């Protein structure tokens, strides 16, 4: 198993873990802030997914310092994992194309 597919798999598993820990930590950070909506676990999980994908529905967001910090980690983990998959696909394409040429 080549490095890029291992990394892609590792990144995926890591992202799922970041999503779950982020849903938990967001609820713990946001309860106690008046007006916060990011305060039950199922919808926090939905929120951490829409944050990692940057899908931008705007139905849920953190209002506290630590929930925003948690949100930043989730954004970066999401954007980064997806970028890694692209890099892994590009390594595949570039290698399969060397072969098509002989090299």
């Amino acid at each position, epitope marked *: 198993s080549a490095l890029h597919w291992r990394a892609a798999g590792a990144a995926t598993v890591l992202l799922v873990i970041v999503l779950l820990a982020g849903s938990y930590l967001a609820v713990l950070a946001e*309860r*106690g802030a008046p007006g916060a*909506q990011l305060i039950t*676990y199922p919808r926090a999980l939905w929120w951490s997914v829409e944050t990692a994908t940057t899908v931008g529905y705007g139905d849920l967001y953190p209002v506290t310092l630590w929930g925003r910090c948690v949100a930043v980690v989730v954004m970066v983990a999401g954007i980064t994992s997806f970028g890694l998959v692209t890099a892994a696909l590009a390594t595949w394409f570039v290698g399969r194309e060397q072969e098509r040429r002989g090299h």
Partner: antibody, heavy 118, light 106 residues
Framework: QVQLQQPGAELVKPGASVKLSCKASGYTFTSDWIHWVKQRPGHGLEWIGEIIPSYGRANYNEKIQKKATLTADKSSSTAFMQLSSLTSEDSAVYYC???????????WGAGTTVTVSS | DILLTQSPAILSVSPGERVSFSCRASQSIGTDIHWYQQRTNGSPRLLIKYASESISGIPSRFSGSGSGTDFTLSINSVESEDIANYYCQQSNRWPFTFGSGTKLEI
């Protein structure tokens, strides 16, 4: 089973303090919150505060005079509410209830009748 | 903080009739409303969650409806054991809050 056990009654002299217990049973998860709710005779339900025992973080109703301090003993699955410097206004039934972090109170304790008197 | 208005405070109904408790939220809260029943000197009992979801152990007689600001708890066919105070509660926004309560009377 009885999932939340509370003492039936506490008598408190005005100015003094009392630590109410709430022993939990049944399924306990790291994600559970225990809430506390005050019911003065013949009146409605009043949310006091919440604790997550598997971390010890507690939040409070900031709209009322802060009388309460929430703690939890992971070892004994018991949540405590320390009510301090009480007056007749603090005489009530205090319920604890368990919430699975999904917004509602699935189970309550029988409640503790607190009486502030000499 | 989200205000939950329950009016009227008392509801007088005849046995077997349908009955509807109103719960109105000061702002839009989706379906994030739950309903408790409390009889004379008992603790509150979860009746309905998320505005319409059944709770195991609760008579099918009970149902809920609404979304946004206006929520209704309903009892097909009222009977004596339904005498109680009925409270709604929201989990949309911190802190959780309760409605002021509606007493059922037969």
């Amino acid at each position: 089973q009885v999932q939340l056990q509370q003492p039936g009654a506490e008598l408190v002299k005005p100015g003094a303090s009392v630590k109410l217990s709430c022993k939990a049973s049944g399924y306990t998860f790291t994600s559970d919150w225990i809430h506390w709710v005050k019911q003065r005779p013949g009146h409605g339900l009043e949310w006091i505060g919440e604790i997550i025992p598997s971390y010890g973080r507690a939040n409070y109703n900031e709209k009322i005079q802060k009388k309460a301090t929430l703690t939890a003993d992971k070892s004994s699955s018991t949540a405590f509410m320390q009510l301090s410097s009480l007056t007749s206004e603090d005489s009530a039934v205090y319920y604890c209830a368990r919430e699975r972090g999904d917004g509602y109170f699935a189970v309550w304790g029988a409640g503790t009748t607190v009486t502030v008197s000499s | 903080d989200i205000l939950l208005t329950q009016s009227p405070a008392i509801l007088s109904v005849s046995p077997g009739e349908r009955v509807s408790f109103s719960c109105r939220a000061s702002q839009s809260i989706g379906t994030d409303i739950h309903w408790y029943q409390q009889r004379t000197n008992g603790s509150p009992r979860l009746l309905i969650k998320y505005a319409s979801e059944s709770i195991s152990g609760i008579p099918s007689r009970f149902s809920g409806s609404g979304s946004g600001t206006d929520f209704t708890l309903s009892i097909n066919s009222v009977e004596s054991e339904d005498i109680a105070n009925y409270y709604c509660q929201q989990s949309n926004r911190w802190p959780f809050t309760f409605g002021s309560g509606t007493k059922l009377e037969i």
